[PDB]
Design a protein around this nucleic acid. Structure first.
Lengths: 190, 190, 190, 190
DNA sequence: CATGAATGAGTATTCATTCAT
DNA sequence: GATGAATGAATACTCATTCAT
């Protein structure tokens, strides 16, 4: 909405990344944004609204940037390949946000996460939309359950990423694109 | 011995956390559920957290063993993998309250509970590593395959499928998804 | 600046501890006595103990400085001792609530409050050492006198007299006991 | 009374001297007495009675041992001499009790300490007896306020002793007897 | 638009005491 | 008389949210 809306959201990322979720009270977020406590409530109406809006904004930029890149290739093998690239690229490009989103937000309470889960519905559409365009043009098993095939895909990508942050980003995440991508299409078999 | 009140308390804790949440499971509430006084809890446990540790150890400390128990009743590696999915899903489908506790409510930890959960988790992860290396060494799986990467695919997929089934309050039959998930892990999307 | 609420708290705490005791002066009770919310207390203080310490410091941290400044207005060393007794008794007789809190209530502390009291107490012991050394260096007190033992006799005599006065509910003139006490510390029983 | 009555009181001294006052729960005292927690209530009314009785029993002996020793004397300042001597000798001969009395009981709530000095009036009366006897036979000056001179003597002896335990009995308490005594009779002057 | 001082609900844990056996 | 398992009352501190300037 306003110009402080972005100072706050970006502060919340940098407050949570450095201090951790349970050490990110409103006042610590405020001081990092150069803003008073009650001013937070002029731009958001909850601590929860701050956290969800953080996710919505960052997720919107995330899915939009991916769908943009897939719009070029017309062929569903590369569309998956591009997805895996872009997913890993964006997270490798911002370690701080990765920490907040893969680690500290996991330490949330339960209905903040159910809300975060609703924000993920957008990405899961892009996945499910890909999985049905791969069935009609017959790139995938033509009796594929898309609900499950989506969950295998996100589950894998999210696990591989989460383990990358717990190792403190020691290794080149994007170097794993080809092996992960090849795994999703082919499976474990020889 | 431990006496009936020990079991009473762990049972009470499981279902309280399951109806109310991790952050709404005050000790008095658990004690009322167990039919004992607040201070009686501390005659069987050190902390509230020791209740939460014992809970996870009793209810999930044989989880991996049980999977291992049935995998050993099969020769073919690809069937072992299927049994692994089947026993992973069967055990969680068999206790809805526990499924809610361990997949949702109790992942919000960062304390010693987080330590103890990772002990059990690690055990599950080596069984995956062993199954993968066996399927590897014996030509079931392609050999340029990376174990730690394939391990993250399998667990990422299963845990995702499970957590989704829990968020939709255990409606659909999780055990019916064993066969579809299995052939996805083996033969990929293509 | 500390702001008006600072010593509203410090004062109200004296009143509560003097009327209920060290063991029944809860934060909420002090808070209401000060006319502020419980949390507001922690805006001007760190702990309950920081309150007790700040209480003792303000109310008793100039106790020795004050005695000292009246002793300076005398040249006779025996007259300085009479002034010391007079000023010791004067200050406590002038604040019955602070006397109850200091002689009976804050004694039973075991923590850092005790460290800060021993600081204030030690300075007083120094003043007694200092005086006693002047006395025997100039022939007022007998040459073979032990300072630490004499410091112990004086303090113990004053402390006992003050304490019994506080326990008989402060209802007899304390300062009227200066002359006989002073005469006893000088001439003994004979 | 009973046989366990004495085991309990002695265990109370042992626990309090070893763990301090704030770590002397009834269970610890029962365990040192070789009895059950509930057995203590077959001999005392409560934990406060255990403490009061402990003082009564130790005080009663302490006063009699002094009283009978003075009965074997003629001169009154010779009686004051054995008082200071026997007072210091009984405390010097039982260190762990002297920690309980001079240290740890001072850390108790006030309205138990006010029960402690009702016990003490027996001893104080003994002093009042000595002081008035000394007045008649002309041993002391005779507008001596016995009520006040009582508070000097006890106040001194107690402070001298309390400092001895504050320093782990690093020095011989009994070598102080006549330096202390001389002070009581002769005061500070040459 | 912005401030930041005030608010006040919420909770794990200890321990003296009881009573069924 | 002895037991000891069970009881339950009692209390400091945090932090998201407001509202008076």
């Amino acid at each position: 909405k306003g110009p402080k809306y972005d100072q706050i959201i970006d502060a919340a990322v940098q407050v949570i990344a450095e201090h951790g979720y349970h050490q990110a009270q409103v006042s610590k977020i405020a001081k990092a944004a150069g803003v008073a406590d009650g001013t937070i409530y002029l731009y958001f109406n909850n601590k929860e609204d701050v956290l969800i809006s953080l996710f919505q904004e960052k997720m919107g930029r995330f899915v939009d940037k991916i769908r943009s890149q897939m719009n070029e290739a017309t062929d569903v093998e590369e569309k998956l390949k591009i997805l895996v690239n872009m997913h890993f690229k964006q997270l490798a490009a911002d370690h701080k946000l990765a920490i907040v989103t893969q680690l500290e937000l996991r330490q949330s309470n339960t209905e903040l996460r159910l809300k975060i889960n609703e924000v993920l519905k957008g990405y899961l559409n892009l996945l499910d939309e890909l999985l049905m365009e791969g069935k009609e043009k017959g790139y995938f098993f033509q009796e594929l359950d898309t609900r499950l095939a989506r969950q295998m895909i996100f589950g894998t990508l999210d696990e591989v990423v989460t383990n990358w942050v717990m190792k403190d980003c020691k290794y080149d995440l994007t170097a794993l694109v080809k092996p992960v991508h090849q795994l999703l299409l082919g499976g474990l078999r020889h």
